[PDB]
Symmetry: C3
Subunit: 142 residues, 3 copies
């Protein structure tokens, strides 16, 4: 509870953001009179819809690496990248909605932020496994 409080905070933040994306899609459906089960129509809608879906399919990847990084590398560092990513995603959604081209900048920022969490998670896990493994390897060649 004490060692994961920040990660949980970022996580909740992330959820709130996804919730926001949804409300926006619901509003797009209304504005452009696009009723389910339809997911296609004017590009101005399709973009808003696609921005929400794209963010939704990366969320688990975010939550996953956020927690692994926070637990095996550094909680504060993992949480900071969590924010930077979450912010980049907001900018992505908002940009994408205006123009498909305006999604790129924010998309890249997201990748960089997400790739850090992955690199950190990797470095964390590596630090946890490698030593013990190398010692077991040496002990073997006794």
């Amino acid at each position: 509870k004490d060692e994961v409080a920040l990660l949980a905070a970022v996580t909740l933040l992330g959820v709130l953001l996804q919730a926001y994306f949804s409300l926006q899609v619901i509003s797009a459906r209304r504005a452009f009179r696009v009723s389910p089960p339809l997911t296609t129509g004017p590009p101005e809608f399709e973009r808003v819809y696609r921005a929400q879906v794209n963010c939704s399919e990366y969320f688990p990847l975010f939550l996953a690496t956020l927690w692994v990084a926070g637990i095996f590398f550094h909680e504060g560092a993992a949480a900071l990248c969590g924010l930077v990513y979450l912010f980049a995603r907001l900018r992505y959604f908002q940009g994408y909605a205006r123009s498909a081209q305006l999604r790129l900048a924010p998309l890249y920022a997201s990748a960089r932020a997400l790739w850090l969490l992955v690199a950190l998670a990797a470095l964390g896990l590596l630090a946890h496994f490698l030593p013990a493994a190398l010692r077991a390897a040496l002990l073997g060649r006794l």
Copy 2:
């Protein structure tokens, strides 16, 4: 293990439900002869497909707030909302499949249940951070 057993139970339940949604979509594909990579056809299919996809994109949001709420607020309360939500989602899927209109009632029930988890998670995290922060704020104005 002892402090999260209920959350894990609800979680497993949630997975089983998603698994159920999938089998249903697979059955829809068969019934309406809609082979991949197609995701469009008769509305009777599209609804079933969309019900499964909509539940799938909220699942992470569910799992996320379920665990944060269960860990920072109250496990039993978080687990109860987990059920209420999971049930609302079943009703959503089943309703949506019949009619796009029959998805609304259950959809709202889902939102309410999900919003609770978020409110609880928020209250939990707030209780964990606020005090320490306020004391640090006061100590500063010494």
Copy 3:
């Protein structure tokens, strides 16, 4: 940290794989000149796109049962099924991309692997709840 290190490893692996699926879809978009917010075009593209989406909607189910199984049943066993599943998913993506029929074999392997995690998670949770419940049931009929 020590009791979940393998699960976190498999998890990170899983993320890396999803990241791989994405890059592939981005490459498909380029190859077949399919720019967002479009998600339809030549079947050779649609399959690649659908393979990535299908893997993305099961990921949370994977992560969920992976951790519940690893925590309530056996970490090493849960991690092994994690690999077997993750491998089956790679084979699924790669097969699907070539042909919709080549996705079936790997898809089934995925189901089997995933169903194990669910069975294990169930057995784990059952072992944690059942006894205490039965004793409470007997104590009642005192």
